[model samples]
Target: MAADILVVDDEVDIRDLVAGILSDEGHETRTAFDADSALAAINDRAPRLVFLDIWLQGSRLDGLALLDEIKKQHPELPVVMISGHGNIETAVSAIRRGAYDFIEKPFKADRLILVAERALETSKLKREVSDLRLELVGTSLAMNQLRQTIERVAPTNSRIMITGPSGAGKELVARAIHAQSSRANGPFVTVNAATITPERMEIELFGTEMKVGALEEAHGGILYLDEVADMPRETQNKILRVLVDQQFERVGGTKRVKVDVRIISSTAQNLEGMIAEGTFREDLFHRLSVVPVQVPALAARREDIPSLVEFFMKQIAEQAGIKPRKIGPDAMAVLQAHSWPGNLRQLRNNVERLMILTRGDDPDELVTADLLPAEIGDTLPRAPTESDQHIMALPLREARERFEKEYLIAQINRFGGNISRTAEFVGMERSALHRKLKSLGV
Candidate 1:
């Protein structure tokens, strides 16, 4: 990931050297001579990482004070302190004050590059973690109810089974439960039963001699069994036994390993139907679904599409370190009307694609209806246009009447000839619309 970095130092030689090194490593670098200039640069545009010299000869804010200011404003931005007079006390103080790392002034290029890369990578990871912490984005009734359910069920140790269509954010719900559970500090180990081959499934879940299984790995945390319906029948039986006893033997060893793990399983398939068909274990189903969570499909909550679009745009922009583009009302309407068969995942991907395809240099640029993919844009009812020479040559009043008839007819057909809906849509009373239809001779 190429990052934008800021190099701040009073000495021109040192600043240029640091900036040049970072630039050589495929990063864009900005040089600032003193604390004031550095602050100004940061205010103009935040950088992924900053290198501040510890001692400023003539600046109002010394390196430490500047570091404090940066941490106060942009706490997530990684900053490294540079010092010609290197000392353990100064390095410790800088780190204690939120500096990411300390580098001596006469640093080697490789050392500087390593620190820069680590800081950039760490910053990216921090952003991702914070994004995950964001609440599920929607205001529809189903979403509100879902949030309430998560709030109610998250603190308990009950095994949860989340049911939703694929890409409906089942994993997010699982993570939310784990994040709010008693074992929030522990690991969140995910076992995708659908992806793991049956031959390797046992060893994967119940470790071998040298390897640790997911059940042990999530000893005090959440073991999210994604697509649990796809697990092999034998593996499902073993999992049921573990749920009952909280103890299991390794795949290749007889030693019993006891674990205190909370199991949160999710599946898009109908586990009940599968159970009836003798493919899934009924006992396992009853054990896992102590509290069932159903995430609504995106199409069921079209009212939330605008908010979701905004959320995804901002999220993608923050991850990429760019400004989010605005979506025009027309474009938003088109998005809301979309079926979203793939659900939230598809919406996010489309938003990312739109951001990348649209011109991003201008901060005021808008994502318009025409920018939408054909599948989405085609859902909107297109306006009727009269391009015939005869219609164009008619008198203004006659032409206006002709266009109204065509537009009304199109809108009426769009609503399946429902006059009340067409009238409301065209901003006219039903009686007036009927009178107009009569005046126009049907």
Candidate 2:
């Protein structure tokens, strides 16, 4: 769970010492003399966590200022603020400004590094979980039940409330459900509650006179409300009326536009948190979450990477002229090691990039080191783990049974169980192959 800590301090001695300590502890470290240097370092490579100093050389951009900028672009990036003589107010402000953890100046390496260690571990888990989810989607038990839920619900017209991080592709799930449903042939219309302003949403979804707005366009389909929590109160109140009762008029329209359409909305963050924080309406939140479908982030199912890679590969190969490359262990190690902060969009883009550049035939194939990014190719103990321990762990009888099972079965499969040929290929008599197969219950 180690992380590359970007140490931003003007003091050369302190920076070197800190960097050395972190590196010695088996984590990457990048030291920046000033805020500008830190910014360049940050832009060049993403660190799991950053350690910043409050003051640096009468700076135009101190650590705090740089942190603000970083938060704006990479809100998920953890920045642990450090100050020589930090106080309660400064510490609180730093936390409020999206600082992850804080350490005072004039600290020992163990003290700071311990905090760094904890921070890095926390950061790694967050990143690992987040990235897994971002790429694959969903981690929750409810989200994991999606396959089963889909199987049960696809045949029905359930008003699904899709929730997950933004760009998690809720609409895609909605489409899948629609594709499986009886109403699939019917146009699956979509309406984003976000697209319409407070004054105009009612006019848009329910409809207005003479194609003025709203539900008129979605006469017989699905309405996808992206960022459903962001909808204004007036719209939220109005949506409850129309969605449940199936009636609403467009702006400037006296006639109520009645329609049958399934409602599915999405959120990037927690809508429930928004409710507790008083940003989102509690009633509306409940109403929207009636049939909740949470998409797990990519990290939740790392095991699914193999299949997803295949899914993406075929799609990419179809688009490009060349074959999609195989993801060998080293490259996969890189993929597995790096916490995907950006999620699936980032993962897909990386996979596509790898496929385009480092094409390989299959899983057993290797993408040569020359083709790898330097970080990906850094020779971290490429030792084979499946050795005698794996075989010897089994009891003697079981081990021999397995060996015989594998060897005999492999020979059979290689020759499709052609008795004489397989026996000859295995340098055994045909009768022996027959005898082993019968004895081993093959």
Candidate 3:
């Protein structure tokens, strides 16, 4: 892999030689003869891999000290130590200090080249693992099993139909499958069958005489059909034909085009139910459901909430161009206790909204329950065992008062703190509701 490299050494000849060799090997190389220039180079632009010397002349910070600084700043950047007067102790010290590799000053060209390639390879592998973790962030048994399923099924060319509730991450699973598939480097075209208008879906899916469609665009890749159960019957027939023959004709065109596409379709609705109702074609459903993947709802995997929140916080902040916010233990407790009826999509939206709301607030603010929207913040449903004990411990009259307070507060917040709406919802007079709010101290 061609990478950006930093060659830092006190000797002019040593720096130039390594830089020249790496540049000839198709890497973008920069040189630094002192610790100051080396830090300056790194500050300007961090290289993919760094070649650091063990000692430097005429510098307040020696090579090892600069290495420590680099590790403090960019711990992920690979650093290789180059030492001419190096002994076993120095080599061991360099490795213990996070050096990717240690090279002697008179190291052979082949050895140096191999070290660089190995460092780049290690970096590339680290990046891919990091990306995969970010993409699939959950340790819940359901999520772990889903990941395992992706690993097993992705290598196959069978059509996959993923079923899940809306916002439960069916599309993410489909994308993950594509990423692990043979066509990972090829185009990944999506067709939202539910969003497309019935009048234009045929042309959109199969293309027109003069236009390319999602199918043609994903000719040698994966075509993800989002909510495919809503696809029109006519289009469903055409899709079934393609599944059977691996060929399709464009709308209003006689010419037939063949494709080597893997179909990974997703839907929130039950396709078998739709098929029974005669809204979806049975043949198409059978063909697509050859490999079925079920994505569990957020409520089913509550243990994953912490991981999801952490990922969402960083992702939302980066997308919003704001500083990432932290959530306190209480806020996380509130999140984990939520039923999450809307699943992953709703959680992501809430995180983005929370970050935007907290953007101009204290940079050091730890997000508390108060900062969350009421529906997410106040509705931490208590288990029967927990709430029952607390209530049973109280006197009957006090317990009743506590329940009344919680009930009224929930209703008021649900209606966006509108007294009139809360009163109507609770079937109480507006005046009585106001009186009760004060009496209950809600």
Candidate 4:
């Protein structure tokens, strides 16, 4: 748990002694003599933890006052109060005012090292956990395979067409491709092909007399066409031709705009169906679908719901300047049971709403099922079952046994495996349930 530690004390001996002790334990130390210097040092480079003296030699704001300012500016950093003229009352006051711990002037070497280690460990864990949350988080086979395909296809210039239900993270995947591609340093321009009218789509794609279109804007980059299947058949032909030749004419202009951009498009509809119906061009379909990637719907990967919920909660908390709250298993059970028809964006928005409506600055407040909106809390199957799929090639007897084992496992997890409680819910005696669990190897 080594980290940068700031030591702020007017006494030169005290400051050096604390710094030396922490340095011996492999921590980087920065020293400041008074409140002003301490604030300046912290502003220059905030430390993982701070050791502040209660009574400074020269400064209106003492150590406690400095603690208040630091907490206001950077609540994430941990600060410990130190004082020679201090007692139990002083320690209590410091603890109530954001200090991680209070240490007397003649502190034990072991205690000083131990408190610093604990505080730094907490700080480091927060950072690592949040970093993981930002990465694409899922353990489902479908998501794993999708990520692999994205990795392989990103470096190539082949056109990509992403298909998924709306809100299923289609744009996230598109951005993932651009982030890993050779054009990562260039701009990524996105357009809703369906939103622009037929008359405007051409002008928007190829630029007008006044402004540049998405193609020119995305030169040497990626141009993402959202709901590309909705692009008018006439406009699709023009786009195809420009993509093939790497050039286009601006609306009402003879100048050909030579652009170097990769085409990456997404659609929530079945383009093949549209093509057969003669509303979408067959030629544009072939051009866009050189590489086809499918994003899984929320129901297909329910195992990832809890992790997604936690990630959104922490992220929203940071943005809203509130402490992140924890959601209980029962509340999570309700969330996992619902059918997220709106998909990832909807889930993220709901999580933000929940955090805002049910949040508290106190650490003790936990998000529970009661806080959930009626739409999300109510309506679902009897309970949330693991969304497992298997081929139906087994014999009837074998299939029944397999299903029994899976059902038992799901029930055990749903109730957190209190043998008595699970038995009561499933209408089984405690002894019988125990024997059943052992027999099924659950």
How many residue pairs clash (N, CA or C atoms closer than 3 angstroms) in each of the candidate models, in the order given?
Answer: 0, 29, 0, 0
Ranking by lDDT: 1, 3, 4, 2
- Which should have the higher lDDT, number 1 or number 3? 1
RMSD of 4: 16.6
Over 211-269, each residue of candidate 3 has an lDDT whose tens digit, in order, gives 79898999889999998977888888889888989989899989998988899999888
Error of 2 at 124 (Å): 51
Q: Whose TM-score is higher: candidate 1's or candidate 3's? A: 1
CA RMSD of each candidate after superposition: 10.0, 22.0, 12.5, 16.6
Assess every candidate by TM-score: 0.62, 0.48, 0.60, 0.59
Q: How big is the positional error of residue 148 in model 1, measured in Å on the Cα after superposition?
A: 1.1
User: Can you tell me which runs of candidate 4 are displaced by over 4 Å?
Assistant: 1-134, 381-442
**lDDT of model 3 at position 16:** 91
Query: What's the lDDT of the predicted structure labeled candidate 1?
Result: 0.85
> Tens-digit lDDT track for model 2 on 1-442?
4577788878887788778988898888998887778878888997887888766776678777888977887778888877777464776688898887888867887997788877767766887776543122343454458766666777877777877654455777778777777777766666666665767666556654554343555556667777786677777776787667888756665766677767767787777787888778887777767688877655544444455557677767766755766567556644544434455666667667777776545645665434655443332223223554766578778876777776666445434346798789668899988897899988
lDDT of 1 at 353: 83
Per-residue alpha-carbon lDDT of candidate 4 for residues 376-438, written as tens digits (9 for 90 to 100) = 754422332344234256666886777677666655554545678778877999999999889
> Any idea what lDDT model 3 has?
0.85
The 10-residue segment of model 3 with minimum total lDDT is 378-387
Instruction: For model 3, name the residue pairs that clash.
Output: none
